[PDB]
Amino acid sequence: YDYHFEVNGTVVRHKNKGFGYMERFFELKESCDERSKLSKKQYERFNALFNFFEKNGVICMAKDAGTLNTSIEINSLAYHGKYDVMKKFIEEQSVSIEDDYKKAFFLACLGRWEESYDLYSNIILNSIDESNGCVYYLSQINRYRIYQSITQAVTQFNGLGLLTFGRHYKPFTDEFLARIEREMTNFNIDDLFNGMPFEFQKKYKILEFLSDNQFLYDDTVKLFELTNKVRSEMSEGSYSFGMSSDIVVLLRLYDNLRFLYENCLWSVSFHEFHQYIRNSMSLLIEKAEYERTRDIDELGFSFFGKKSGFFMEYYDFVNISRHFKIDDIKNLERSCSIDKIRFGEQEKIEEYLVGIAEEITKQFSANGMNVVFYTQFISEAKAALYFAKYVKLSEEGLGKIVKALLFYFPERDLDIGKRYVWLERLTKCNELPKSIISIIDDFLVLQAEKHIDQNYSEVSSNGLYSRDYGALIKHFEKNFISKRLSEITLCLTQDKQKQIDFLFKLLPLLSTNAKSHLLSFKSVENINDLMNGIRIGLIDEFTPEHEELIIEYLETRKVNYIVEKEKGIQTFSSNDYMSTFGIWYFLEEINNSKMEEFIGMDDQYDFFVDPENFDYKKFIPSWLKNYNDKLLGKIAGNKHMKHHVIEVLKERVKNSNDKRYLEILMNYFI
Amino acid sequence: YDYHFEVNGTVVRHKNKGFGYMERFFELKESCDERSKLSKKQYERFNALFNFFEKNGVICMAKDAGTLNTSIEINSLAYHGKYDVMKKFIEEQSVSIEDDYKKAFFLACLGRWEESYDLYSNIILNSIDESNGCVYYLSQINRYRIYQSITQAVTQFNGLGLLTFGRHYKPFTDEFLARIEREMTNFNIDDLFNGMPFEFQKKYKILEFLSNQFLYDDTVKLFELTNKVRSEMSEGSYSFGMSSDIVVLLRLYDNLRFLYENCLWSVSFHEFHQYIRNSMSLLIEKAEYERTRDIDELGFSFKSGFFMEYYDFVNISRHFKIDDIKNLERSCSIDKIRFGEQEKIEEYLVGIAEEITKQFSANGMNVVFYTQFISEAKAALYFAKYVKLSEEGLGKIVKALLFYFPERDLDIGKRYVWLERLTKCNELPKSIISIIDDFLVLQAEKHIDQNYSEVSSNGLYSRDYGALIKHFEKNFISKRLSEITLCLTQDQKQIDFLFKLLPTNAKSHLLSFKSVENINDLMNGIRIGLIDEFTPEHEELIIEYLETRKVNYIVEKEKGIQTFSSNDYMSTFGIWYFLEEINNSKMEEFIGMDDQYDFFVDPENFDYKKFIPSWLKNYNDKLLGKIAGNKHMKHHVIEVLKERVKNSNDKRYLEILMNYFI
């Protein structure tokens, strides 16, 4: 502890009670003529130490400090996702035991844990003879880590994973488990630094911090004090001169990432380190958004020349795309504004996503799905594809990405509606070529070929279906008629009526004779038929028989509700067509007194029938979320509900952070 | 680790693979008939362990237990600040070495640090062979911590304390410094758990927590729960049954009771204060998000508002800094929260007040109490602004902060800030009016000297105290100040002081003695209401001041000078011109380079791109009414406020919009 080695690269004397030998080293680095005063072997050693320090980037002291621009370098093929290259590297013949260590690291990264464990055991077998103690140390560390991996995989594998996949397919045999549990019985990891010889301690005293179950706990609290600093800084809003703490955070993060990944430790893939870099880059991007939004008046305007806003970089893109989770993406999406954030080096993102798409193509092309690689890969794939909505890419790479996500991806993990949401994000980022329209058409052909079963079930979490796919196709080009769907519709028979309903969801891309045959086979019977016929543009005005069916449905609903008044049922479903009827009455689309008799049922519909006699206390302003502009103007076309709605919207906007309701008040009420 | 023992008090079987002895233990606790089927030595052993478990609050397994209660109890004398009672107990008879350890913890907590170190060393010398190394372990840890505390204190004494006090003011000598240096040479901390014998390790491995990374794992757990709490804060959620705020609160109170009750000195340290800061701020933010959230049907299908306690008031006062609770003011509205137990708060705060009275009555000041206590006392008088006090306690607190608080640590205007905050809660008693009258007489007799100047960082001076007086009661006239100024001698600093602080017979002597002149003096005259209509000679004074201003601008525009005096008189003159109080056109004949002044003087000819929203921040209602009448000052200011409302998140611009422009 004689020197502070702060993260920028500069070194400050801390406890050197004598000659400034580090400063003398940099003084000898300053002059080649002073380097000539050394011996020849001393000159070679000085050159070696100079090469070591420029490899590790340690530059100068605070007395001669200048400008230290950052730089990101990672040479790990495992971090880059070059899976084929490391496959060929495993397939090569081993030359040294270090090459065997890299082979075992890549085998563990691919997830083939059995030969990884055996290869690590053989590395431990070899390393005794040559006295390579450090490689022995990290080999024992990785052995305990893969033991933790195997035990955790076994414990979570026999339980909820059976409900996840419907079958065990337990990857290992019991003899392998017996061998490891004999080898790792009552095994401490804290002993490890003590057990190594004394000269190993005296030289590798750095390496003691690896061996702890509380690994990176000091790293976590060193982050957390800085997070407190950043929170106080954004609350006050001060002018941070010198260098701000987020620079220290990013430099510490990149140093940890390079140290962990380059030295081939398996401990990178763990939940706690994922949480660490999660909140780390979350705090960094939230500070970036705050410094974008901030306003200044007098001195900061005199003091803020060349303010570097945070960009998007390929290392930052991978660090976002690997160790994240979708709920955290929604969390950062509620805050921030990612559209204002500049992106760069998008060709590297394009080739990384191309490598991801080809990897999942090779994985799901056959039935040889490695369960370990699947479990370690699909969440990273989900994070990368969800973060892909702010990058503009070329046509062919977008086509490969869309085809891979639509075809070679498990529907048991990602539903159809979430696929629709993700490609909707892709379409709002980048416009849609007609070949990709043909790709989506072939995707819907595959959906219909799944729909040929009379026992088939179509499941969507968010309730989005292929009608919305065809609606998006019409939204980018109304003129396109799917001829493949037209001849499929021409191939329909009488008994295929469920498939006829699924194609009835897909109206506007059909042919005239096929539409005539469909309308011959279609009859407006239930309320969902009315919802589809008003959804596909079939029904535009309201025939009286529609009113008869609606009043019959509401009569049955009132009979059931009078029955249920004895019992304890209040809410029914999300199929809330009754408030839609009240909306249509509010838009004067139905003017019958029979539905006016139906008041007193549900709070939305009771508001929409008689807003003057509505009890405003039961009004829920979250309903104000799910309205459109024309309905908001018609809402503005009534005095009585506005008399309370202005005050209610004011107290909701003032006492909360709803920017959408702020815009709702702003655009229409003033 | 055969069972998990969580903070609520329940037991979960984790690695217990043999006989279920803890479950059988609670089954034996269930039946008194099974309690009879035991040896009575073993039965009273069972009852003693039952008393132990109820002392530590272990209640059943998780399956056995139903509802649970949050219970809080602290028996520490230093927790409640019984300072004089601690003085008496220090002065009392010392027999037990456990009582000696408690007295040494008190002596460390009462600033006798070298004396406490001597007592710790004698405790070690007595407990050399006393058949329990627990006290030895605690005494060694506290000896190391007080060594580091003395070392860091003397290094901070060596540096900026000389700058703060104007004196080196060293309270220590090198004898015990060199003695503790050789005594703590090569003294590590992690060896100490190895230092005890084998059987002590085998019986007391639970005490490994005290062995340099204090609260490191607990801060890790606090951090991950902080991430979880903000993650569920970011959207709608329903934390059913156990909720994370209960976990945070129970972990906080468990750590605090374990540290305080066993008398460990490390509660003085900064990182524990950071721990309390983060935990309490997260709890406050949870309370705000609970009170402010929307209600859907399940919330109607399923209150639980946070209630502050006297323990919470102590936790607020001990471990906070003024800027952090200012940020707490910026985030959450504290004033809408429920309060209670006001008698304990009143006696605690008046105990702090009488401690301040005793310490600052005599000039002999001990710096250790000063440095450990001025932040806690400032935090206490900060957070006193949500407490309702009886007149005796309120008056004693007010006179203690007025007359005994050191003027180096607190500006007079800064004292006026706390006076404003305490007078917002309650009314102004006439006794308190007499107390602030005594304080202003003290200021008046301070102002006799021809070199005293009431420097105030906030710019609020002694007139604002009497302005507060007339804000509460205007028809009352100050009497003792009038009696002092009735004997005014014309031979002048104090004369101008009471000229500021004036608002008849007392006024007549001053008005005879005065000389109406200048600009800032005219600013004072219009501030106190002496000047109410602008005479032409006042307009001539403003004209010649703007002549001096344009001469200085002509000089300074040859070079680069940007900032000017903070008392922007010319901008206020332009305000008064567009408040239409002034009728002179020669002042607006020359355009002043202040952008607010150009904003005023050009009502439709000013470049709106250089407008500052903070100008709109610090205005008043009448200026907003004046700006509502200008058609050119409608569109640009409305769209600037629109974009500022859209970008930022503070609530003030919303009130600025809704007060006049909606």
Next chain:
Amino acid sequence: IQDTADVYFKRKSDGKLVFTAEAQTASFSILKSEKEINLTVKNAFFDLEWLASERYEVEYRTDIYIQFPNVSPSGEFEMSLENGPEIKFEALADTDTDEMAVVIE
């Protein structure tokens, strides 16, 4: 009127219970309305004779009953080095029988 609720997860091909547990956390979200509910639930014991796709249903009880017949489990992968149990599942929505709010008071 109480707060603590028990949850029952079962499968609607035989009406047989899969596991029982305690509720922890809910998550909410011709126009169209976009709301989505996901549930996180703490440690449980599974069905022993279950060991010898489909549709699944969830019951909540606290009398107050909250039931829904359209759920799917999502067991996300976890990787803990300390070690020493979480259940996450989401709701589903079909077309004709779209119904997820069964309430008994």
Next chain:
Amino acid sequence: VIQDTADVYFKRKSDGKLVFTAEAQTASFSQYILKSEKEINLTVKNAFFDLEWLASERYEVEYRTIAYDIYIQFPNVSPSGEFEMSLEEIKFEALADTDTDEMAVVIE
């Protein structure tokens, strides 16, 4: 354009004597007779104290950087003392005189 790494000299109004030299990291400016309060806060690192000065009171701050020659002067200041202690930085705040309430001097 400003490199945003300024340097601070801390002096005393008596003799113009330098008290110490440092560099600042955080500075915070915050908010008839129009009354407006403004507050300034400064934070520097572990400075270089003068042993010559080792051989209340009013002090001043100057704050120098380059914009391409930009100098800042605060005449009246108080170094408020915060005593802390821990295991194993100097803050200032402004002072406004009642005679001529000026705080910032800029030489460009």
